[PDB]
């Protein structure tokens, strides 16, 4: 069955934006379609890279299934629950995208993350992650003790290195900071590699797709 999004965009739903809660009883799908203008695109302001290419791909698939690749409790080195924002509310309190994890410092430290996930499935995996661009130097230190940070994402077909741009931006949904999100398709035997000392928005859930 085709997934028709009533109030939400593709980006918002894949990331699991709290503002798009629509009743879904059956968790298997064929493809994803976006009609007209979505009420909620991104609750935390920012950008979604290669969005047009991704929407075409997800309308080009005949099977769509969500799965948990990296459990949020598997981060014992950092804080995976406290990173939240008022721009993404849930039940009146601060929250975040459900399918992606905002990692912040545990105590006074943010150790360097080296984590690898190998696709062990028989299907292509849609994997999403992000980078957070903090408001100023003060906010950077608040969230992650390390002033100078990076995000490395490797795959056999991709080499990415991100450096957060610390700048004050226009207030959208109450926030002067931004978040940039990225995606790739992980081949059934290929593995994705992450390295970060800060500003990393880590994947929890991914999506098995069939062409």
């Amino acid at each position, epitope marked *: 069955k085709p997934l028709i999004l009533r109030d939400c965009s593709v980006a918002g739903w894949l990331l699991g934006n709290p503002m798009c809660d629509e009743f879904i009883n059956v968790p298997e799908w064929s493809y994803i379609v976006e009609k007209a203008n979505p009420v909620n695109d991104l609750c935390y302001p920012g950008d979604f890279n290669d969005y047009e290419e991704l929407k075409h791909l997800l309308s080009r698939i005949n099977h769509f299934e969500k799965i948990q690749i990296i459990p949020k409790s598997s981060w014992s080195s950092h804080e995976a629950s*406290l990173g939240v*924002s*008022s721009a993404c509310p849930y*039940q009146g309190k601060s929250s975040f995208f459900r399918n992606v994890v905002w990692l912040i410092k545990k105590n*006074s430290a943010y150790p360097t993350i080296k984590r690898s996930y190998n696709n062990t499935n028989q299907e292509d995996l849609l994997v999403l992650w992000g980078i957070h661009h903090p408001n100023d130097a003060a906010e950077q230190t608040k969230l992650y003790q390390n002033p100078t940070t990076y995000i490395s994402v490797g795959t056999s077909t991709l080499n990415q290195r991100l450096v957060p741009r610390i700048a004050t931006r226009s207030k959208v949904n109450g926030l002067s900071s931004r978040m940039e999100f990225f995606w790739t398709i992980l081949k059934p035997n290929d593995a994705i590699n992450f390295e970060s000392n800060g500003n990393f928005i880590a994947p929890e859930y991914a999506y098995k797709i069939v062409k």
Partner: antibody
Amino acid sequence: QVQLQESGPGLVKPSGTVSLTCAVSGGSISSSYWWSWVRQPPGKGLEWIGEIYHSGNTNYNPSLKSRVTISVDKSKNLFSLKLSSVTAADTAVYYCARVALFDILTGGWFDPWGQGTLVTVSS
Amino acid sequence: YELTQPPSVSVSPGQTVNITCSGDTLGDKYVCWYQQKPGQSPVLVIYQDTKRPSGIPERFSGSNSGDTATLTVSGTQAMDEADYYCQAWDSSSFVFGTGTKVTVLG
């Protein structure tokens, strides 16, 4: 400006229920704000009691959690406090306050505050 | 969870006074500060560690690192004599500091 006003009986007998309400003017109870109760026994520090959101969600001080109830009346545009099974340790000045969320992370700040009302527990 | 403040501090008029607030992993939490005159309601001076509400003089400033937060008043006047409480949030509970009395020596 938004203003908060506490009212209720200033004298409650031991084992009785402290019953207070907070009138909100200048703003609506249905907001992104939370509505909190805070008490201060005479000559002592501030103590958080609990809070409530217009949807009905509540959060209470775990040490008072057994005997405390906070509710909200959207029509009369007010929220209220019921603290049961009181003792002399419950004699305090009771404040109500509006709580705002941080743009990032957990918690929030209290503003504005009501004038506060003294509640004495004595038989 | 508890927030510890010094019971009292005194400061000469025109000098600078630091009000400290201590707690476990307090640097991971945003801290707020409240001014209270006797027989009156608390007044927000500093929220989200460094921010001043409109109507609060630039005299007031705050900072937070490690396990300790600090409220700072520079060139303090007579009207700045009051009680000061730090505040934070932990595990679905709001927490207030024990309070600090600031006396400007007259």
